[PDB]
Design a protein around this motif. Structure first.
Motif, PDB file in Angstrom:
ATOM      1  N   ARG A  28       0.827  -1.220  -0.098  1.00 45.81           N
ATOM      2  CA  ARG A  28       0.004  -0.036   0.258  1.00 45.81           C
ATOM      3  C   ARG A  28       0.752   1.229  -0.094  1.00 45.81           C
ATOM      4  N   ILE A  29       0.449   2.066  -0.909  1.00 48.85           N
ATOM      5  CA  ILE A  29       1.273   3.526  -0.906  1.00 48.85           C
ATOM      6  C   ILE A  29       0.300   4.477  -0.429  1.00 48.85           C
ATOM      7  N   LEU A  30       0.311   5.098   0.551  1.00 47.64           N
ATOM      8  CA  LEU A  30      -0.583   5.966   1.299  1.00 47.64           C
ATOM      9  C   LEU A  30      -0.475   7.609   0.523  1.00 47.64           C
ATOM     10  N   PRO A  31      -1.382   8.281   0.428  1.00 48.64           N
ATOM     11  CA  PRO A  31      -1.285   9.686   0.194  1.00 48.64           C
ATOM     12  C   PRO A  31      -0.055  10.402   0.555  1.00 48.64           C
ATOM     13  N   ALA A  32       0.081  10.038   1.858  1.00 46.15           N
ATOM     14  CA  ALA A  32       1.440  10.951   2.526  1.00 46.15           C
ATOM     15  C   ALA A  32       2.622  10.509   1.991  1.00 46.15           C
ATOM     16  N   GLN A  44      -8.495   1.820  -0.737  1.00 44.33           N
ATOM     17  CA  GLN A  44      -8.265   2.408  -2.081  1.00 44.33           C
ATOM     18  C   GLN A  44      -6.712   2.715  -2.683  1.00 44.33           C
ATOM     19  N   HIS A  45      -5.789   2.392  -1.480  1.00 45.66           N
ATOM     20  CA  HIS A  45      -4.360   2.579  -1.942  1.00 45.66           C
ATOM     21  C   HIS A  45      -3.682   1.523  -2.162  1.00 45.66           C
ATOM     22  N   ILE A  46      -4.089   0.291  -2.581  1.00 47.76           N
ATOM     23  CA  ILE A  46      -3.449  -1.121  -2.879  1.00 47.76           C
ATOM     24  C   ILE A  46      -3.561  -1.273  -4.310  1.00 47.76           C
ATOM     25  N   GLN A  47      -4.354  -0.484  -5.071  1.00 47.25           N
ATOM     26  CA  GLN A  47      -4.413  -0.841  -6.347  1.00 47.25           C
ATOM     27  C   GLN A  47      -3.235  -0.117  -7.170  1.00 47.25           C
ATOM     28  N   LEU A  48      -2.588  -1.054  -7.893  1.00 49.81           N
ATOM     29  CA  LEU A  48      -1.196  -0.671  -8.535  1.00 49.81           C
ATOM     30  C   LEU A  48      -1.208  -0.856 -10.082  1.00 49.81           C
ATOM     31  N   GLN A  49      -0.593  -0.021 -10.820  1.00 53.35           N
ATOM     32  CA  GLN A  49      -0.660  -0.153 -12.099  1.00 53.35           C
ATOM     33  C   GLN A  49       1.122  -0.425 -12.477  1.00 53.35           C
ATOM     34  N   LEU A  50       1.260  -1.381 -13.004  1.00 52.09           N
ATOM     35  CA  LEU A  50       2.626  -1.628 -13.278  1.00 52.09           C
ATOM     36  C   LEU A  50       2.885  -1.464 -14.879  1.00 52.09           C
ATOM     37  N   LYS A  61       3.069   1.911  -9.833  1.00 54.44           N
ATOM     38  CA  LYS A  61       2.335   3.110  -9.405  1.00 54.44           C
ATOM     39  C   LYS A  61       0.984   2.903  -8.752  1.00 54.44           C
ATOM     40  N   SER A  62       0.790   3.892  -7.943  1.00 52.76           N
ATOM     41  CA  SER A  62      -0.610   3.998  -7.213  1.00 52.76           C
ATOM     42  C   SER A  62      -1.804   4.598  -8.174  1.00 52.76           C
ATOM     43  N   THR A  63      -2.728   3.724  -8.403  1.00 56.33           N
ATOM     44  CA  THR A  63      -3.689   4.365  -9.364  1.00 56.33           C
ATOM     45  C   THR A  63      -4.381   5.125  -8.719  1.00 56.33           C
ATOM     46  N   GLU A  64      -4.718   5.141  -7.285  1.00 50.58           N
ATOM     47  CA  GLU A  64      -5.320   6.342  -6.668  1.00 50.58           C
ATOM     48  C   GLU A  64      -4.788   7.712  -6.792  1.00 50.58           C
ATOM     49  N   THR A  65      -3.420   7.809  -6.449  1.00 47.17           N
ATOM     50  CA  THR A  65      -2.656   8.975  -6.148  1.00 47.17           C
ATOM     51  C   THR A  65      -1.680   9.446  -7.060  1.00 47.17           C
ATOM     52  N   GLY A  66      -1.416   8.287  -8.039  1.00 46.47           N
ATOM     53  CA  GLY A  66      -0.420   8.466  -8.993  1.00 46.47           C
ATOM     54  C   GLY A  66       0.892   8.546  -8.570  1.00 46.47           C
ATOM     55  N   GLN A  67       1.050   8.112  -7.180  1.00 43.30           N
ATOM     56  CA  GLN A  67       2.577   8.175  -6.687  1.00 43.30           C
ATOM     57  C   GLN A  67       3.063   6.950  -7.278  1.00 43.30           C
ATOM     58  N   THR A  73      17.884   6.097  -0.672  1.00 38.95           N
ATOM     59  CA  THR A  73      19.356   5.573  -0.437  1.00 38.95           C
ATOM     60  C   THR A  73      19.713   4.757   0.799  1.00 38.95           C
ATOM     61  N   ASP A  74      18.615   4.901   1.714  1.00 40.14           N
ATOM     62  CA  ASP A  74      19.049   4.034   2.906  1.00 40.14           C
ATOM     63  C   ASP A  74      18.087   2.932   2.986  1.00 40.14           C
ATOM     64  N   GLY A  75      17.507   2.556   1.985  1.00 39.67           N
ATOM     65  CA  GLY A  75      16.592   1.325   1.667  1.00 39.67           C
ATOM     66  C   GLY A  75      15.283   1.340   2.057  1.00 39.67           C
ATOM     67  N   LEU A  76      14.703   2.801   2.525  1.00 41.75           N
ATOM     68  CA  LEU A  76      13.281   2.832   2.692  1.00 41.75           C
ATOM     69  C   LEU A  76      12.396   2.935   1.584  1.00 41.75           C
ATOM     70  N   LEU A  77      11.217   2.418   1.570  1.00 50.42           N
ATOM     71  CA  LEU A  77      10.454   2.544   0.449  1.00 50.42           C
ATOM     72  C   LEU A  77       9.632   3.703   0.867  1.00 50.42           C
ATOM     73  N   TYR A  78       9.111   4.457  -0.304  1.00 47.44           N
ATOM     74  CA  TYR A  78       8.418   5.655  -0.178  1.00 47.44           C
ATOM     75  C   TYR A  78       7.712   5.831  -1.565  1.00 47.44           C
ATOM     76  N   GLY A  79       6.547   6.752  -1.402  1.00 52.50           N
ATOM     77  CA  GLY A  79       6.013   7.325  -2.730  1.00 52.50           C
ATOM     78  C   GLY A  79       6.178   8.425  -3.086  1.00 52.50           C
ATOM     79  N   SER A  80       6.904   8.456  -4.372  1.00 49.13           N
ATOM     80  CA  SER A  80       7.695   9.471  -5.199  1.00 49.13           C
ATOM     81  C   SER A  80       6.432  10.287  -5.936  1.00 49.13           C
ATOM     82  N   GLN A  81       6.360  11.639  -6.050  1.00 52.22           N
ATOM     83  CA  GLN A  81       5.401  12.123  -7.063  1.00 52.22           C
ATOM     84  C   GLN A  81       5.587  11.983  -8.491  1.00 52.22           C
TER      85      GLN A  81
END
Length: 141
Positions: A28-32, A44-50, A61-67, A73-81
């Protein structure tokens, strides 16, 4: 190449849920911009388009937020705009069944996308071939 080239079948025509067999959570990639997993199929944040950038290289990519899913660099997953080098993943077949996603940027270090049993994402250096945390099944939405 630092890795094998066994590719999963399936395609990118439709969005998918990325189900982690470790604890049964959907990525899941949350809006934040935070990334984790949830067992709630109604989220609504687990639908992904590869999409494939090169054979076997993808954006997630998150279909809900476009992220875009990305690993820093330190190995943490994040949502990028926006899409950047940290957003490309090598999508490979694993154990003749699952899909695994290796950070292209950190491929020589074998950093994978992975979810722990409690639903928190694993940091790159803590992942490695052989774990259940890195195994996913793309399911229809």
């Amino acid at each position: 190449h630092h890795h094998h080239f066994n590719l999963p079948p399936g395609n990118y025509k439709k969005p998918k849920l990325l189900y982690c067999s470790n604890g049964g959570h959907f990525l899941r990639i949350l809006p934040a911009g935070t990334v984790d997993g949830t067992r709630d199929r109604s989220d609504q944040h687990i639908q992904l388009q590869l999409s494939a950038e090169s054979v076997g290289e993808v954006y997630i990519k998150s279909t809900e937020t476009g992220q875009y899913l990305a690993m820093d660099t330190d190995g943490l997953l994040y949502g990028s705009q926006t899409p950047n080098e940290e957003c490309l993943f090598l999508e490979r077949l694993e154990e003749n069944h699952y899909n695994t996603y290796i950070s292209k940027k950190h491929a020589e270090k074998n950093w994978f996308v992975g979810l722990k049993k409690n639903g928190s994402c694993k940091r790159g250096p803590r992942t490695h071939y052989g774990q259940k945390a890195i195994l996913f099944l793309p399911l229809p939405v």
